[PDB]
Amino acid sequence: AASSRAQVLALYRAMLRESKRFSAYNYRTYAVRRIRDAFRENKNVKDPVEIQTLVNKAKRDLGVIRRQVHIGQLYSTDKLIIEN
Amino acid sequence: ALHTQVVDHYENPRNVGSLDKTSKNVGTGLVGAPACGDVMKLQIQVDEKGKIVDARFKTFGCGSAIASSSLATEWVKGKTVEEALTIKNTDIAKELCLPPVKLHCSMLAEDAIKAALADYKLKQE
């Protein structure tokens, strides 16, 4: 209801870029995968009100990701054996 | 926590294998039970002067069991049959820093040394 589509593609890029900054392999791989899967799963929603609900949820989760990426950087640890 | 002395006997295995049970110069000790989660096979090869010249082992058991029996197999080499008989569970435990919950492993390793030696001795008249 303010170009859902521009909000949506901008959010998609922002969420993927910020989730690649997770220091922890398990949060990072999960967030990137989950975001890809969720936007794809919801691609064919057509009700403008339902789209707006999903967009508002994505904005809330983008805030979660930004905060958690930054507090996983403050308290980071060694990489996992499979990151080598 | 991690126990570097014990894990070494798995990551850097030595003397794992078998000797020829039919040899008059080979003693075989097989002790423990599958149902108790610890079975040690220890074999010694003795030369015609009574010096243990080689030894091999196979163990089903936790890491401390593998280390106890592996250490015992190293330690008998170069000892006379009479000298090997004096290796004690407590020497093995000390070398490996075994905690009290695992001292039963070093005792079964001692039992294995003595079973192998008794097998050898029975073969010499």
Binding site: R67 | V39, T59
Partner: protein, 401 residues
Amino acid sequence: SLRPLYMDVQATTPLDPRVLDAMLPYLINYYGNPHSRTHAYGWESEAAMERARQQVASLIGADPREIIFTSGATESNNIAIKGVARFYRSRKKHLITTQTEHKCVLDSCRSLEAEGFQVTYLPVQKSGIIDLKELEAAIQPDTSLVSVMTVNNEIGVKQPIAEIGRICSSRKVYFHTDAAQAVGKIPLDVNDMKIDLMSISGHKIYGPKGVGAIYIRRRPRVRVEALQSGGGQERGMRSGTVPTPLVVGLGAACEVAQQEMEYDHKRISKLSERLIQNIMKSLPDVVMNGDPKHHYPGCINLSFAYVEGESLLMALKDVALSSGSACTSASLEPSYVLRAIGTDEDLAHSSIRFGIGRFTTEEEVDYTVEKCIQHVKRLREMSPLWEMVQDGIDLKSIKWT
């Protein structure tokens, strides 16, 4: 040093970042006691507590008034078992449970036997599943409680909860299920399943440690004697200071699990099938403990014949796992669960539990499978039992010392 892969989610889970994010405000500025009635620090802390209560209730189909916060499913199990038994102790002295329950259920029942109660510990079949008809036959006129856990923590096998609730409801016997390993992973509805009490653990569902809950049905009313004495918090059922940050984290984890359960189940099912099939197609003499037809896929318990479990864990040095061999489980006791499903003792020393959770990756599974295949082969080549079997010997014929 590089860190090992976490494949032990049945032991505990990492916190979902969405859960830590919800908790953090209560650890920084919203630090009020939720029992403080005269000020805004108390009001906002109370309001967060009550929001979390609704989140827990929504996941299981309950009314928030039926949710009591506790310090973990251990405490919830004690409250359900001891609370119900002690309340109806004038009229009822018998309770029924199973041989594969978690240790807090079994030891609560043992404590009650020392109190003069009679307990039937039902056997399970080799599948790990109770026999519903044996449960029916065991209910007595003075039976106050049946307790049967939803998902087993060791082998992952699902008990027929809805069918047990039908049996208990029809005989007016209270039905408790320890749902610690099932909450947020498989559908739970207290009314469709006819559940009277249920134990919930926050740290088994990406929530923080030190918190849990107990569902206590209010219609028809289920009565329980409180165990923790105090000022009457949590409707007189759990006195003490409700830990706002922790219960916020529990409600957030339940909310997230409600939204993510279907996605997780699909993804974990596929990873679980991959791990089981890839190991079994590459190694002989590998057996799954528990019936795969009634099984939560994220808990996989396999036995590797002729290799001792602790040694395999040691060998899998960069993977965090767990085992049923006695020297690894607090260093005391062998697996009573494997014994109850009729596993030969030696094979039960040979069992490993693999956990797959919300954050597990396909590469983490592939790495674990590859190392498992390599190390089982290596430990077999070290094993006198494998050597004897390869020379055609029947281990059942040997006379062990």
